[PDB]
């Protein structure tokens, strides 16, 4: 069960 990382608080997106 993989998931996306695009947190609106951390300034890190990695998912696309």
Give the H/E segment covering residue 12: strand 12-14
Per the listing, tokens 């998931």 go with 3
Q: How far is it, in rounded angstroms, from Cα 14 to Cα 11?
A: 10
The token pair that represents 5 in the structure block: 């990382």
DSSP, collapsed to helix, strand or coil, labels residue 13 as: strand
Maximum Cα–Cα distance across the chain: 24
The token pair that represents 4 in the structure block: 């996306």
Q: Note whether 4 and 15 are within 8 A (CB).
A: yes
- In sequence order, what are the beta bridge partners of 14? 5
**Which is nearest to 15 in space by CA: 2, 1, 3, 4?**
4
Q: From the centroid of its chain, how far is CA 12? A: 6
């Amino acid at each position: 069960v993989p998931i996306i990382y695009c947190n609106r608080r951390t300034x890190k997106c990695k998912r696309f």
